[PDB]
Subunit: 214 residues, 2 copies
Amino acid sequence: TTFKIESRIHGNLNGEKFELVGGGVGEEGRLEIEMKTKDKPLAFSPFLLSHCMFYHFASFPKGTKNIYLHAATNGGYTNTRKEIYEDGGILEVNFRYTYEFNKIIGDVECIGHGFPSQSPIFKDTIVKSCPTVDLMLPMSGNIIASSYARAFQLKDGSFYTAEVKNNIDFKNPIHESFSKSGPMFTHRRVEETHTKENLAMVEYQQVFNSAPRD
Amino acid sequence: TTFKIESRIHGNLNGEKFELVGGGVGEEGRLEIEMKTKDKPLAFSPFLLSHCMFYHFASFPKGTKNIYLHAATNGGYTNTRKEIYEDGGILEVNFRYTYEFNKIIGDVECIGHGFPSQSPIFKDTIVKSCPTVDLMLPMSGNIIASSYARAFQLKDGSFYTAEVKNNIDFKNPIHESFSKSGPMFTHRRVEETHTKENLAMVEYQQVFNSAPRD
Ligand SMILES: [Cl-]
Ligand SMILES: [Cl-]
């Protein structure tokens, strides 16, 4: 099961517009994607776009169907994210998808504002995005509210953090196998190799609903 | 490895004081505790106190030492929590511990304020505390910043949520085995059997630092 991935990220950060285009491939639990800026290099850290660069590619626990792929087969879904950084920077991202045979095309609108001049995203001191574990809650109206804190590791070993919320809006009922009585979690991690002109990343996602050990 | 647990929870919620006393036992990855209110039954849902009722009892991944038990052997640590509920209720909890041979005594001060009259904690509609996965970040000064969202499941199947932050303050350096380059997570769940006079709970905690599957 290997789908082709296509994406375009557009928007602006602190008033300056940017645009990236690219793609890659995804399978159960892993995706790889490479994107390039158009017209000019990025005016801020490329690591801020790593999470902007497809929930469809997470592996699910036995017994629970992949709700994102299931939705893609009917109506689909959108995801709206808001990241509130500890220094006041706010990143708002809206994910919309279109599907073709064996291919998912993402349209990502990203608006960043309120990042101070001293922010790590301008000092270019971020070296990697740390892993996260998302709490997903099925809610009335075919919505899933997702929440988690995240951190970027900086050159000196310290972290730059944000509190993140996602509103996943499904056109149709979320697959019944996805228990709506309790929450499920998604562990996510990425491997990044970026420059201000060419971004590259591999991402691993795993949905789970029980402790790792016994 | 079976430690005796002792605890006293005291404080007030929306101005009315309350006090509970009790104890139980804990081991690697599991604890059980029973507590009773003093003088009067609780004026709000006992489920709000489940998480107030010992990080020491989590199992750790191979290679990482239990930082809480390690600290207990030297200087110890305190934990300060703030839960911000979606309806404005705020619960502030401070955990302090004293140790005796084979026993941990918790002193828990709990202050709740701003809960509206219509809050689920007064309608008594909460039926259980959902599991959580905490993101732990080692920070300068022997502190660990912990963050996660949590939810209570209500009688009608819907949820009552909060965003939670914990500031774990260690007297001495956190054990070196606890990598300070990246974050670690703690999966936690509880089994509750409460009345407004007698609370009982079993809790399972697992610290992990890698996806559950391959
Ligand atoms: Cl511009
Ligand atoms: Cl009182």
